[PDB]
Design a binder for this molecule. Sequence first.
Ligand SMILES: *[C@@H]1O[C@H](CO)[C@@H](O[C@@H]2O[C@H](CO)[C@@H](O[C@@H]3O[C@H](CO)[C@@H](O)[C@H](O)[C@@H]3O)[C@H](O)[C@H]2NC(C)=O)[C@H](O)[C@H]1NC(C)=O
Ligand SMILES: *[C@@H]1O[C@H](CO)[C@@H](O[C@@H]2O[C@H](CO)[C@@H](O[C@@H]3O[C@H](CO)[C@@H](O)[C@H](O)[C@@H]3O)[C@H](O)[C@H]2NC(C)=O)[C@H](O)[C@H]1NC(C)=O
Ligand SMILES: *[C@@H]1O[C@H](CO)[C@@H](O[C@@H]2O[C@H](CO)[C@@H](O)[C@H](O)[C@H]2NC(C)=O)[C@H](O)[C@H]1NC(C)=O
Ligand SMILES: *[C@@H]1O[C@H](CO)[C@@H](O[C@@H]2O[C@H](CO)[C@@H](O)[C@H](O)[C@H]2NC(C)=O)[C@H](O)[C@H]1NC(C)=O
Ligand SMILES: *[C@@H]1O[C@H](CO)[C@@H](O[C@@H]2O[C@H](CO)[C@@H](O)[C@H](O)[C@H]2NC(C)=O)[C@H](O)[C@H]1NC(C)=O
Ligand SMILES: *[C@@H]1O[C@H](CO)[C@@H](O[C@@H]2O[C@H](CO)[C@@H](O)[C@H](O)[C@H]2NC(C)=O)[C@H](O)[C@H]1NC(C)=O
Ligand SMILES: *[C@@H]1O[C@H](CO)[C@@H](O[C@@H]2O[C@H](CO)[C@@H](O)[C@H](O)[C@H]2NC(C)=O)[C@H](O)[C@H]1NC(C)=O
Ligand SMILES: *[C@@H]1O[C@H](CO)[C@@H](O[C@@H]2O[C@H](CO)[C@@H](O)[C@H](O)[C@H]2NC(C)=O)[C@H](O)[C@H]1NC(C)=O
Ligand SMILES: *[C@@H]1O[C@H](CO)[C@@H](O[C@@H]2O[C@H](CO)[C@@H](O)[C@H](O)[C@H]2NC(C)=O)[C@H](O)[C@H]1NC(C)=O
Ligand SMILES: *[C@@H]1O[C@H](CO)[C@@H](O[C@@H]2O[C@H](CO)[C@@H](O)[C@H](O)[C@H]2NC(C)=O)[C@H](O)[C@H]1NC(C)=O
Ligand code: NAG
Ligand code: NAG
Ligand code: NAG
Ligand code: NAG
Ligand code: NAG
Ligand code: NAG
Ligand code: NAG
Ligand code: NAG
Ligand code: NAG
Ligand code: NAG
Lengths: 98, 245, 175, 196, 440
Amino acid sequence: EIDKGIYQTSNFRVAPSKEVVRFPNITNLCPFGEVFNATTFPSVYAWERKRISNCVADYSVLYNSTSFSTFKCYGVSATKLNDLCFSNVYADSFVVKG
Amino acid sequence: SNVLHLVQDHFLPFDSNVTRFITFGLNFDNPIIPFKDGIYFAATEKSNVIRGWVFGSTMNNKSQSVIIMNNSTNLVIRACNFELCDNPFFVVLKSNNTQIPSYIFNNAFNCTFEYVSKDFNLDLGEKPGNFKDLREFVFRNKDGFLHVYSGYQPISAASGLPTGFNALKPIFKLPLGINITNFRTLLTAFPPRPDYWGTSAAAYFVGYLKPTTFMLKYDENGTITDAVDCSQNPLAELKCSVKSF
Amino acid sequence: LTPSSKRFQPFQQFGRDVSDFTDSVRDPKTSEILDISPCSFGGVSVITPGTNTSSEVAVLYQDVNCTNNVFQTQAGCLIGAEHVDTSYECDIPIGAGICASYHTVSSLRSTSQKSIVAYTMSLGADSSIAYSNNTIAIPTNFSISITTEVMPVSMAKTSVDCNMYICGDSTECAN
Amino acid sequence: KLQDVVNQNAQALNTLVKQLSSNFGAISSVLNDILSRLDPPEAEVQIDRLITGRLQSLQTYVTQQLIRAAEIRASANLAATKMSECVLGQSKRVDFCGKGYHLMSFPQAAPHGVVFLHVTYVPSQERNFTTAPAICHEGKAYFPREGVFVFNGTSWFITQRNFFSPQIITTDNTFVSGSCDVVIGIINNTVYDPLQ
Amino acid sequence: SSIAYSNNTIAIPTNFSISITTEVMPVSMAKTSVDCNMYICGDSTECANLLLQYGSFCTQLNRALSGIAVEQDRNTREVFAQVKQMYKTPTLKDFGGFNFSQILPDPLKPTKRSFIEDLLFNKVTLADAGFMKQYGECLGDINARDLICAQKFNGLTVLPPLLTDDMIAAYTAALVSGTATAGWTFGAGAALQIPFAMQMAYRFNGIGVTQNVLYENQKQIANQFNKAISQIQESLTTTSTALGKLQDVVNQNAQALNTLVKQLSSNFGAISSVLNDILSRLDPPEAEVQIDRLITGRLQSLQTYVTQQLIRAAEIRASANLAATKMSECVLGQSKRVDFCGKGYHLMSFPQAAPHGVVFLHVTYVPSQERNFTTAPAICHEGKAYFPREGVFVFNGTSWFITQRNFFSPQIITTDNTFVSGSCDVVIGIINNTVYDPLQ
Ligand SMILES: *[C@@H]1O[C@H](CO)[C@@H](O[C@@H]2O[C@H](CO)[C@@H](O[C@@H]3O[C@H](CO)[C@@H](O)[C@H](O)[C@@H]3O)[C@H](O)[C@H]2NC(C)=O)[C@H](O)[C@H]1NC(C)=O
Ligand SMILES: *[C@@H]1O[C@H](CO)[C@@H](O[C@@H]2O[C@H](CO)[C@@H](O[C@@H]3O[C@H](CO)[C@@H](O)[C@H](O)[C@@H]3O)[C@H](O)[C@H]2NC(C)=O)[C@H](O)[C@H]1NC(C)=O
Ligand SMILES: *[C@@H]1O[C@H](CO)[C@@H](O[C@@H]2O[C@H](CO)[C@@H](O)[C@H](O)[C@H]2NC(C)=O)[C@H](O)[C@H]1NC(C)=O
Ligand SMILES: *[C@@H]1O[C@H](CO)[C@@H](O[C@@H]2O[C@H](CO)[C@@H](O)[C@H](O)[C@H]2NC(C)=O)[C@H](O)[C@H]1NC(C)=O
Ligand SMILES: *[C@@H]1O[C@H](CO)[C@@H](O[C@@H]2O[C@H](CO)[C@@H](O)[C@H](O)[C@H]2NC(C)=O)[C@H](O)[C@H]1NC(C)=O
Ligand SMILES: *[C@@H]1O[C@H](CO)[C@@H](O[C@@H]2O[C@H](CO)[C@@H](O)[C@H](O)[C@H]2NC(C)=O)[C@H](O)[C@H]1NC(C)=O
Ligand SMILES: *[C@@H]1O[C@H](CO)[C@@H](O[C@@H]2O[C@H](CO)[C@@H](O)[C@H](O)[C@H]2NC(C)=O)[C@H](O)[C@H]1NC(C)=O
Ligand SMILES: *[C@@H]1O[C@H](CO)[C@@H](O[C@@H]2O[C@H](CO)[C@@H](O)[C@H](O)[C@H]2NC(C)=O)[C@H](O)[C@H]1NC(C)=O
Ligand SMILES: *[C@@H]1O[C@H](CO)[C@@H](O[C@@H]2O[C@H](CO)[C@@H](O)[C@H](O)[C@H]2NC(C)=O)[C@H](O)[C@H]1NC(C)=O
Ligand SMILES: *[C@@H]1O[C@H](CO)[C@@H](O[C@@H]2O[C@H](CO)[C@@H](O)[C@H](O)[C@H]2NC(C)=O)[C@H](O)[C@H]1NC(C)=O
Ligand SMILES: *[C@@H]1O[C@H](CO)[C@@H](O)[C@H](O)[C@H]1NC(C)=O
Ligand SMILES: *[C@@H]1O[C@H](CO)[C@@H](O)[C@H](O)[C@H]1NC(C)=O
Ligand SMILES: *[C@@H]1O[C@H](CO)[C@@H](O)[C@H](O)[C@H]1NC(C)=O
Ligand SMILES: *[C@@H]1O[C@H](CO)[C@@H](O)[C@H](O)[C@H]1NC(C)=O
Ligand SMILES: *[C@@H]1O[C@H](CO)[C@@H](O)[C@H](O)[C@H]1NC(C)=O
Ligand SMILES: *[C@@H]1O[C@H](CO)[C@@H](O)[C@H](O)[C@H]1NC(C)=O
Ligand SMILES: *[C@@H]1O[C@H](CO)[C@@H](O)[C@H](O)[C@H]1NC(C)=O
Ligand SMILES: *[C@@H]1O[C@H](CO)[C@@H](O)[C@H](O)[C@H]1NC(C)=O
Ligand SMILES: *[C@@H]1O[C@H](CO)[C@@H](O)[C@H](O)[C@H]1NC(C)=O
Ligand SMILES: *[C@@H]1O[C@H](CO)[C@@H](O)[C@H](O)[C@H]1NC(C)=O
């Protein structure tokens, strides 16, 4: 029940009706084979840094080819990896013991 | 745009002491200047005497070093294990105004980084008058990256570092991952006679960055046109507190 | 998304305002700067009589120019209230000199149904008094008036037990 | 007005109670659930969040109560002033005690307040009258003493402004100063002397 | 300053000046409302659901702000709507030589308000410049970072006053016209028409000066009244900080809303203040921790705004109560309270409409050109002590007389001007003089 008078309701709202996804034009896949299937890996002290640019990071191709015992992401969510675009991405490779 | 932005980073404090190294006559300044946290580099020159720098820790082949020299044709960034010459220079004949090969290092091995710029033409000729160009650089080494900020200003000062304000834009973020504690400038030489050396008038200035609070002002076009050093004086710390000039 | 006049340097992709809200973005496919604006920009109020009195409602949009009733006020576009040229005392204050009430309006035939009406409120009774250099008004009678003035003096004195309100009968929360 | 006060107070408490059902970044607002479901280390975070939220709620209640108490203090100061000036005396302040000229006031107790019955004098049934600033009797100007010169229609009288009571213009009701030419609207009339 | 004391020197003013002073009083302040969801979450459904799960206590905030808004409309009504009947502006604006043209609306002017009122509205610069801003207007004005568009995009609204500026000026015109025509009578009861010169004579009697002083000096006083009005007009035309009190009020309200907007860039223990950045990067479990921190900090910011608004509204309420008291006591009547309405003995006051306030022009009687005299407490005529009745004995340098303290008008000491009580020995400074008897 409302008594007589004038009341401030919520601000006028517009519900979005369409989605607009805009990504840059990329035609190639990221060098997953070059990074995760390299013939040789460096020592940990001489760890090797490589730059990645202009590619689609579809890690579903990593399935059925490689199996990771450790996979942990910091500052980001794993389930969010497919919906993002990454800037200044580098891959560091080395070998340690268990 | 149209905002006052307060930011804390490694900045060159206002009215800081800046050491000067000159190349004119009988002195060819090539010392080993410590890098510390970071350096502000400004070169006053009418001719392209300044060519680049060499950053490292021991400045020999016992550790990795990076060279950002600009030869006559293109800019070369090379992070390698360099047997650096104690007196590295370029050589250009004063009358011929041509560059001939010169040695910065004896041997390079175990190299980790390499970058070559696009080809361009550089004027090696000696020029008369006062200093015509001012090139400003900021070098920051943090988290395995060498940050380079560059800015250019036309000046007409005969001596000293001209006063003013200039915002340096980011040009390079080099993934070197090397320990940098020292650096040496690379200048070209103008030898008139073989077996003897010569110099052309040019100067560069070195200042050390410190962690400070700055209030940057953005104009309509998004450029930085002025700044306030909130640690300079009690008046300046008042302006930053109230966020107004 | 709207076209923008902002100029972005090659190393810039997003822009923010003083609220740190992302308001500009460079489109990836076509390097054009676009401006992003919130979808909600409405000042909305609802005028109602008593709920038991009626379920009719009049809505005021403060930021909308009107170009069933759709009357335009200086307060905003008012929808669902009839505009009457008669000036009354204020009942529900719409604003900017406009008030609203629930008055019996015979829109069709003589329906004798009540509707929400919007009007310019009356400031007071209109009067005219004559001035001259030699006329004075002297009262020939008087009345004894008694008026009431109600003034609050005190309010309820209250106390709060912190451990009870915050933790209740919990020892762990008390510690 | 009085009702309003009490209403606010009730609201200020009821809201408090309802705010006990509020999560503040915690899994639940029920302390017993958190204590029954988690170890002391894991329950400490949720309990701290609830503690911060409830302490903020109490802070808000006390601040609003302070402001309301300041308003009530101002109202009670005005009421005490009115008791001293309208009830214990007669006030010449306009509209301080009722409408019209103040005669007296009577206090009455009310729930958390006071009701003042202001007894006032209201003039009515006015009548228009020709009037003059002064009277020119014999080269001398006579001004009324606590009154106004009025014209019934036939002869001039002097009356008090508030109530109409015509009196014969005598030397006791008027005082003489200056000459007749200075006053603008001066008119000619006789001033009765009881001595003659 | 140095002032001399003695047992028989009194200073009686021999002249006076009509002075008009201004008093600027705030009456109301901007009425504001806040959209809880817009300010904290914007157009974010994920945040809105978390704000619902979080204890949202911002129906309490809007309740406090709505109470402020109703009080602001109450403040103006209590000050300006004290007149029951609107009195038409007289066609002629020169009552007995007193010029009321400037403080009354000009029929030819389209602004339907007084000339002085126009000067006041030009002084204070208002920020809103209207209470309507359309969606297309702010979209087309994105290049210029308008503060009003910025705060309206964040759920902060300013509600228009119930009484428009023309309505308040209408109340002021009725108040000025009623005083110039009906005098003090319409303040307490029905209006009684009285000639303005006689009204001035009555007011002179109230401050203890006889009526003849007004009538014999009517031309001089009317000229002094007109010049005093012009000096007020000239002072307002030149730039000044006279209306700074009203300007201070509007500055605080705008500053509070701009602080609210700037606090949205605030992190509260969170990774970022941008809600979209957090949601684009974390799962609902991990984003819940960050969003809750932003919710708590932003709710506290709104709490601080409302609490400061409540305290500011209390000060405006106290100021508006004083203005409502000054309207009844200085405008609708004559006040014997010292320094309540201007400096000096109060004659009359004229209200003027101002942005979010009221300006009072207080007409006061200021004595000047005093003269020293030899004075005695009483007169010993024949074994009897004669004390003055509403006056003071003054030697004048020749013969003892009796005069009113405020204005010097020597009168022959008669049995009418004095009363006799006791003997001569009791009084200390009693002196010998003759008391004239009319019947002798
Ligand atoms: C400045 O430094 C740059 C980078 O070191 C020099 O550019 C590169 O110079 C090398 C050596 O002359 C070139 O290698 C040569 O390539 C040709 C085929 O193109 C081959 O026939 C030669 O035997 C030799 O391997 C390299 O191509 C060249 N790269 C570019 C981008 O031009 C540059 O010449 C230096 N300029 C001077 C000396 O001022
Ligand atoms: C009380 O002080 C006022 C001043 O505020 C005195 O009024 C002044 O009176 C003198 C003489 O009556 C005026 O001088 C006249 O000036 C006109 C030109 O305007 C000239 O034609 C006359 O021949 C004469 O010289 C003076 O203007 C006037 N000033 C004002 C402002 O009105 C008043 O006389 C004083 N009263 C007593 C009892 O001292
Ligand atoms: C690293 O640098 C040192 C110093 O320049 C080199 O040592 C010199 O080696 C040459 C032979 O190549 C000798 O003739 C010099 O006498 C040595 N000097 C000193 C001071 O030891 C060393 O060979 C370099 N190692 C490299 C190039 O890997
Ligand atoms: C931002 O950039 C624009 C475009 O360069 C500047 O506008 C020009 O300003 C110059 C110098 O006043 C004029 O000669 C041009 O005619 C302007 N062109 C246009 C498109 O208007 C603008 O002044 C710059 N703003 C700032 C403050 O740097
Ligand atoms: C990336 O691809 C898109 C889609 O092909 C390009 O957008 C179109 O470009 C063509 C040629 O310039 C235009 O005629 C169309 O009108 C564009 N359509 C859209 C979607 O605007 C876009 O230009 C490409 N960008 C790059 C980086 O080449
Ligand atoms: C709303 O928009 C209209 C224009 O569409 C504004 O002016 C009205 O314009 C029409 C058509 O030319 C005229 O017939 C009316 O007389 C105009 N006046 C009004 C007040 O209706 C109108 O001013 C706008 N209203 C607001 C408050 O923005
Ligand atoms: C003028 O005032 C006088 C005094 O009140 C009024 O005269 C009286 O009239 C009544 C009725 O005729 C007589 O009984 C009295 O004897 C009169 N008194 C005197 C002193 O003459 C008279 O009515 C007034 N004039 C008007 C027009 O009202
Ligand atoms: C009041 O009486 C006086 C004197 O009896 C009148 O003044 C006279 O008026 C006549 C008419 O013009 C003049 O001729 C005389 O010179 C005046 N006498 C003096 C001494 O100035 C006066 O007019 C009367 N007033 C009214 C209103 O009748
Ligand atoms: C009251 O004051 C106003 C303002 O000074 C007077 O109006 C002026 O009159 C003069 C002479 O006619 C004009 O030159 C001005 O332009 C008028 N100003 C305005 C604002 O209208 C008015 O005449 C005065 N009234 C009287 C009779 O004293
Ligand atoms: C005022 O007059 C009285 C009486 O005329 C004076 O009192 C007399 O003063 C003389 C002088 O000392 C005495 O001898 C008389 O005895 C007094 N008479 C009485 C009845 O007391 C008085 O002195 C006079 N005052 C002044 C200031 O002259
Ligand atoms: C894994 O997937 C590839 C296709 O991407 C397929 O050719 C191959 O047979 C699969 N199994 C392996 C590599 O054991
Ligand atoms: C790497 O390449 C070898 C040879 O083609 C293949 O047998 C192996 O499955 C590959 N592994 C990955 C990580 O794709
Ligand atoms: C000058 O430079 C040109 C080009 O390098 C070269 O051919 C010529 O021999 C040089 N002459 C001198 C003076 O050494
Ligand atoms: C560095 O170079 C030396 C030879 O000078 C070599 O023995 C050593 O293995 C190299 N180390 C790395 C990290 O490549
Ligand atoms: C509303 O009005 C109806 C009819 O007068 C009455 O029966 C009912 O009790 C009222 N309810 C309230 C909320 O006052
Ligand atoms: C009073 O006013 C009338 C009408 O304006 C006028 O005719 C008359 O002369 C005035 N009398 C006085 C005393 O000024
Ligand atoms: C006085 O005159 C006015 C018209 O100017 C009239 O309205 C009023 O009733 C009169 N009062 C009396 C009863 O004399
Ligand atoms: C009155 O006496 C005081 C003190 O001697 C003096 O300052 C003042 O000027 C005197 N005034 C007159 C008008 O004599
Ligand atoms: C007052 O004193 C003066 C100067 O002594 C004198 O001329 C006058 O007659 C005295 N009396 C009056 C009339 O005030
Ligand atoms: C005033 O005081 C003086 C000094 O004490 C004294 O001589 C004189 O008689 C006194 N006059 C009176 C009584 O007023």
